[PDB]
Design a protein around this ligand. Structure first.
Ligand SMILES: [Ca+2]
Length: 223
């Protein structure tokens, strides 16, 4: 997250770190046994780390749980990033309380102009590289359909939206992929892609979660 602020310990209690000997992606806890993340983050041997704030120090509150299943959406396209969503089943249920909690799925799409919270442990610089120890947050609005398509001609599907800032300096970034975009207490997006990070006229592009609510519930119920 570039241009964001330190969230504070366990103020985003649904935020997870996906770990393979290092932090590589984010995700969102949606019930005690299941996490939602981005398909482009798929790999085998995932450990899910819940209740994290400082990802390099054991502070108390963490729960580390192995992934037992990782289900990439069957229509995921790795060139376009269409259908960039995956579901991870935890090997055992997480223990939920005030510091570890699930986030609700949407019950309608969010409009243009709605303010959302985006969070993660990704790069905090637009040019070079610097990775934070603690969780960073950014408030960003959802942009209009037309501005999104003007920004990325021919690349925006109906399963994507843009959010952020067209003037530069505030965006999600590498290492934030798969992390949550929450508006009014609902998970509306998943951090997916963008051109650099925090460049002028190039906002972040997010998977539109409300299009996948029925798929998510059926996939959970079957697995
Ligand atoms: Ca920690």
């Amino acid at each position: 997250i570039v241009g964001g602020y330190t969230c504070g310990a366990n103020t985003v209690p649904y935020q997870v770190s996906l770990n393979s000997g290092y932090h590589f992606c984010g995700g969102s806890l949606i019930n005690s046994q299941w996490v939602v993340s981005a398909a482009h983050c798929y790999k085998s041997g995932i450990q899910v780390r819940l209740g994290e704030d400082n990802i390099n120090v054991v502070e108390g509150n963490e729960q580390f749980i192995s992934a037992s299943k990782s289900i990439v959406h069957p229509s995921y396209n790795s060139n376009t990033l269409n259908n960039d969503i995956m579901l991870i089943k935890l090997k055992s249920a997480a223990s939920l309380n005030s510091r570890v909690a699930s986030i609700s799925l949407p019950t309608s799409c969010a409009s243009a102009g709605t303010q959302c919270l985006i969070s993660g442990w990704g790069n905090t610089k637009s040019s070079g590289t610097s990775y934070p120890d603690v969780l960073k947050c950014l408030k960003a609005p959802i942009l209009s359909d037309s501005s999104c398509k003007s920004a990325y001609p021919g690349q925006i599907t109906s399963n994507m939206f843009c959010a952020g800032y067209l003037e530069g300096g505030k965006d999600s970034c590498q290492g934030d992929s798969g992390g949550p975009v929450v508006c009014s207490g609902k998970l509306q997006g998943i951090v997916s892609w963008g051109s650099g990070c925090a460049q002028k006229n190039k906002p972040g592009v997010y998977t539109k979660v409300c299009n996948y609510v029925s798929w998510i519930k059926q996939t959970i119920a079957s697995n």
